[PDB]
Amino acid sequence: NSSPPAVPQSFQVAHLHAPTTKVPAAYAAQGYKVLVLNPSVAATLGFGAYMSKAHGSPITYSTYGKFLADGGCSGGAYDIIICDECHSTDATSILGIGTVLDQAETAGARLVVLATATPPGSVTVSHPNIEEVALSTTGEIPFYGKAIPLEVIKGGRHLIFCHSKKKCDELAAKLVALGINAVAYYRGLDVSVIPTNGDVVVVSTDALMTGDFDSVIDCNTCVTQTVDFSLDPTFTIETTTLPQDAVSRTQRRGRTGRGKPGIYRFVAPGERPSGMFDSSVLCECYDAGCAWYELMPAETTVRLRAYMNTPGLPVCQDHLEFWEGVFTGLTHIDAHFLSQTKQSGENFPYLVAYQATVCARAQAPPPSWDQMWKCLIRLKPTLHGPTPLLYRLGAVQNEVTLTHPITKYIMTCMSADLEV
Amino acid sequence: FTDNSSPPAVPQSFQVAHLHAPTGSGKSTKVPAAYAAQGYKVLVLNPSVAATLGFGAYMSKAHGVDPNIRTGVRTITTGSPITYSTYGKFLADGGCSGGAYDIIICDECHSTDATSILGIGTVLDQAETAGARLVVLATATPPGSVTVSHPNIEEVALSTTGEIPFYGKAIPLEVIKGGRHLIFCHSKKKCDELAAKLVALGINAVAYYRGLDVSVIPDVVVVSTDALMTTGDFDSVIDCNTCVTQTVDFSLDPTFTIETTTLPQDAVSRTQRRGRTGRGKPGIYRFVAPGERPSGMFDSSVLCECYDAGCAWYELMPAETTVRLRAYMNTPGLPVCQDHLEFWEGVFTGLTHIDAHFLSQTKQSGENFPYLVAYQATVCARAQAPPPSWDQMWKCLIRLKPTLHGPTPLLYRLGAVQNEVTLTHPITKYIMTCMSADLEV
Ligand SMILES: C#Cc1cccc(Cn2cc(CC(=O)O)c3ccccc32)c1
Numbered sequence: 005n006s007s008p009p010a011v012p013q014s015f016q017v018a019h020l021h022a023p024t025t026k027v028p029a030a031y032a033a034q035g036y037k038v039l040v041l042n043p044s045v046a047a048t049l050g051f052g053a054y055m056s057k058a059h060g061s062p063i064t065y066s067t068y069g070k071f072l073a074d075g076g077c078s079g080g081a082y083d084i085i086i087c088d089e090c091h092s093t094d095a096t097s098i099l100g101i102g103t104v105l106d107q108a109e110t111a112g113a114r115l116v117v118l119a120t121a122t123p124p125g126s127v128t129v130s131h132p133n134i135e136e137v138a139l140s141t142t143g144e145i146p147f148y149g150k151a152i153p154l155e156v157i158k159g160g161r162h163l164i165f166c167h168s169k170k171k172c173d174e175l176a177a178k179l180v181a182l183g184i185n186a187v188a189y190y191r192g193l194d195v196s197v198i199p200t201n202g203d204v205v206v207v208s209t210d211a212l213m214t215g216d217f218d219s220v221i222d223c224n225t226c227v228t229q230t231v232d233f234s235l236d237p238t239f240t241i242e243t244t245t246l247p248q249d250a251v252s253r254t255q256r257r258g259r260t261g262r263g264k265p266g267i268y269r270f271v272a273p274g275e276r277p278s279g280m281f282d283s284s285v286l287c288e289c290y291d292a293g294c295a296w297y298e299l300m301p302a303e304t305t306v307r308l309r310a311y312m313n314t315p316g317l318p319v320c321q322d323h324l325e326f327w328e329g330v331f332t333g334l335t336h337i338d339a340h341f342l343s344q345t346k347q348s349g350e351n352f353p354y355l356v357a358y359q360a361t362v363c364a365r366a367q368a369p370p371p372s373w374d375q376m377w378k379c380l381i382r383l384k385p386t387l388h389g390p391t392p393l394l395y396r397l398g399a400v401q402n403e404v405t406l407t408h409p410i411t412k413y414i415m416t417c418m419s420a421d422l423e424v
Numbered sequence: 425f426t427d428n429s430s431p432p433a434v435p436q437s438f439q440v441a442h443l444h445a446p447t448g449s450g451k452s453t454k455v456p457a458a459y460a461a462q463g464y465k466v467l468v469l470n471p472s473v474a475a476t477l478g479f480g481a482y483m484s485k486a487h488g489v490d491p492n493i494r495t496g497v498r499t500i501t502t503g504s505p506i507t508y509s510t511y512g513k514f515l516a517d518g519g520c521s522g523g524a525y526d527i528i529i530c531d532e533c534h535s536t537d538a539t540s541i542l543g544i545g546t547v548l549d550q551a552e553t554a555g556a557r558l559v560v561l562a563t564a565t566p567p568g569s570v571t572v573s574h575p576n577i578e579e580v581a582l583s584t585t586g587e588i589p590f591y592g593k594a595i596p597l598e599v600i601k602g603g604r605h606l607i608f609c610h611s612k613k614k615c616d617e618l619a620a621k622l623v624a625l626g627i628n629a630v631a632y633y634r635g636l637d638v639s640v641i642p643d644v645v646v647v648s649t650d651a652l653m654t655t656g657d658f659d660s661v662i663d664c665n666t667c668v669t670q671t672v673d674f675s676l677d678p679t680f681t682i683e684t685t686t687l688p689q690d691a692v693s694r695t696q697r698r699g700r701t702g703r704g705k706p707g708i709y710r711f712v713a714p715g716e717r718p719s720g721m722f723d724s725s726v727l728c729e730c731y732d733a734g735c736a737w738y739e740l741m742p743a744e745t746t747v748r749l750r751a752y753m754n755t756p757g758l759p760v761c762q763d764h765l766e767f768w769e770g771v772f773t774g775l776t777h778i779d780a781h782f783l784s785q786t787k788q789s790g791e792n793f794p795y796l797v798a799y800q801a802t803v804c805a806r807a808q809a810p811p812p813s814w815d816q817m818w819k820c821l822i823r824l825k826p827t828l829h830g831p832t833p834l835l836y837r838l839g840a841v842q843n844e845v846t847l848t849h850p851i852t853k854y855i856m857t858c859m860s861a862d863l864e865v
């Protein structure tokens with residue numbers, strides 16, 4: 005829907021399909037208490053005040069993460085809850101939105117607005133300020149099957165997106181050897197980008213989020229987390245390289261043509277339509293419900309079910325029964341290990357710590373000694389033998405045994421809860 | 425590349441045009457007729473054999489125009505300026521033969537079966553050289569499309585309250601007897617669980633999947649997969665909203681696996697299942713899930729199939745297939761996939777000296793990857809080793825008795841593997857090297 009919903013007389017959930025702050029102000033004029041939720045409340049530009057800044061109330065600005073950590077809706081705090089950027093498919097956004105949908109009516113809200121500039125099926129649209137030119141096979145620098153001519157990046161400031169750190173390092177090196185002032189950027193860095201202007205080409209992943217560029221060169225692919233039901237013995241959380249989607253393409257292209265005209269150069273003309281996410285995100289939600297939010301798996305199900313019963317939101321395979329059953333069987337986790345995996349910012353702190361629990365309780369070693377398995381560096385009492393492998397969270401370098409009862413439990417959940 | 429809601433005028437020099445229009449608006453009939461009327465010769469390409477034959481028959485009856493009809497099974501030549509062909513038959517004919525057509529309409533250009541992708545890629549690569557003035561990429565559902573409401577169809581979410589356990593939800597008995605009803609499941613099997621557990625009921629209901637053809641009453645409830653094509657009166661449709669699709673897994677055990685996966689349905693699927701009601705008589709649509717994948721992506725396994733058919737049916741060197749597929753991928757406004765052209769070209773280029781007779785058989789069998797099947801069977805026979813299983817797939821080896829000594833030299837996984845295997849065959853190692861060479865991160 006193109007325009008802001010009128011407040012209904014009984015509770016309803018509406019959609020606001022915006023174009024690319026004013027809408028909350030309106031409801032607040034009508035005397036309504038408004039909660040706005042975003043992934044983050046830092047300024048969109050990356051520069052500016054926080055959205056939560058006072059004197060700029062009947063309008064509260066928070067995040068899905070804080071909302072979840074606060075425990076959801078309070079029993080009568082708001083009339084209207086705005087779930088902004090409701091296309092976001094990170095775990096926190098999905099669980100937080102699911103929670104709003106499940107709780108808002110009971111907490112006495114009259115309206116939930118699911119707002120986004122990018123609803124399901126959206127595609128990138130032409131930008132008036134940005135000329136788009138396909139890469140050809142001609143040029144000195146090989147780039148994902150096409151080529152970059154040295155001329156279009158010699159002099160000026162340019163941004164090149166690659167899908168991985170390695171390709172970034174690799175590409176930067178070839179440019180440096182041809183005289184280009186090339187800086188590689190990825191997570192684990194900052195500052196190395198020459199701000200003074202002066203010629204540069206930044207070769208980056210999507211870690212970058214401030215200065216401005218004459219052109220953007222896009223590989224048009226991105227790395228994503230996926231779950232594989234691989235039966236070796238159970239499932240695997242891994243990464244796939246996929247074609248980018250419309251938000252990614254729009255976001256990357258958007259680093260140029262701010263003010264002055266810009267150029268966007270691409271490897272592929274197309275994108276994935278926005279609007280699906282992977283079952284591994286569901287797994288993340290249950291993990292986070294158990295590790296962070298003191299949510300029983302069934303309480304997590306209720307919130308996620310509310311999500312999936314709601315039309316116009318990103319879609320995913322219905323694996324709630326499966327994942328709820330998996331985490332239900334993961335009992336007697338070692339509390340110390342969980343603290344440690346939480347503390348270190350592991351992706352699946354509950355799963356990592358639970359695998360650790362099973363290792364230590366059977367005095368067996370981790371699937372590896374990658375720093376994921378850090379909490380177990382009691383390496384010598386442990387070292388003895390095959391790993392009781394529950395599931396694959398990374399590459400395995402130890403000998404394994406597939407016979408632990410938890411392993412059989414998960415396999416049984418797989419055969420029973422996953423559709424044929 | 426130009427975007428159109430109506431038939432683009434024939435330009436003076438070559439042009440690729442996109443036609444996004446309701447498919448009742450005679451994309452396949454009114455549009456080529458209007459071009460013919462202007463003096464052009466027009467080729468109309470469709471994925472379906474039945475559709476191609478059906479446009480010919482509609483033009484004859486409704487307009488007394490007898491088009492040329494070209495399909496695998498059946499070829500008719502009247503000399504009409506209108507030709508209807510399947511993409512597959514178009515490819516068998518060598519693609520664009522010089523000077524034959526002024527206008528080529530790639531109808532249902534959203535289609536992602538192999539014949540459409542290789543066929544459209546071939547048109548985009550060859551048309552201008554062959555003297556065509558215009559290529560029209562025609563679909564009702566371009567990339568990114570979502571289902572829109574149907575004026576004649578009321579849509580009602582299924583609740584969990586009901587006598588009928590249906591994909592985590594419930595069908596209340598009251599909404600399906602009497603009247604005429606169609607129910608979509610995703611596999612053969614649960615077309616039964618639903619069917620059987622349905623005359624503890626009252627029925628007239630029966631389950632169609634692949635092997636049946638027509639048992640349908642024209643008071644009923646039909647429970648079927650997608651194989652029932654778009655017949656006979658329904659007051660309602662009820663949709664499990666999931667589908668089975670083919671995918672490739674780079675499983676490194678030793679190489680890759682062709683397998684299937686259950687996914688949320690996409691929009692072309694939803695619209696189409698829903699479409700079998702509200703055909704004049706207003707209909708009700710009941711769904712398990714309010715959501716759908718937007719249309720416009722396909723799996724790398726379809727690329728594999730293109731190269732496979734290129735070698736098996738169309739005598740295309742893998743490098744030739746690549747050129748056609750590259751033209752598809754370089755063209756804006758089409759379904760996208762992972763860029764695995766180098767990898768699959770590489771794979772098939774290494775597969776030499778296939779047993780011609782094994783290939784003949786897998787082709788006549790209608791197996792899915794006749795080339796890959798016949799090739800695995802080729803290396804089995806030459807190593808005197810048995811097939812990966814004794815599935816119907818491997819029946820060209822059905823004079824087994826000498827070729828059983830030990831392990832299967834496994835090149836790739838096309839199904840379940842029941843025999844013991846070895847992983848050291850040079851062709852296996854070759855594929856493994858191509859994986860390192862051409863697949864990312
Ligand atoms: C790409 C591709 C591909 C995939 C499967 C089967 C086929 C074979 N195939 C299909 C058709 C379509 C048809 O039967 O008309 C065809 C026509 C002539 C020769 C071969 C034909 C091609």
Ligand SMILES: [Ca+2]
Binds near residue numbers: 233234
């Ligand atoms: Ca798999």
Ligand SMILES: [Ca+2]
Binds near residue numbers: 232234673674675
């Ligand atoms: Ca796998």
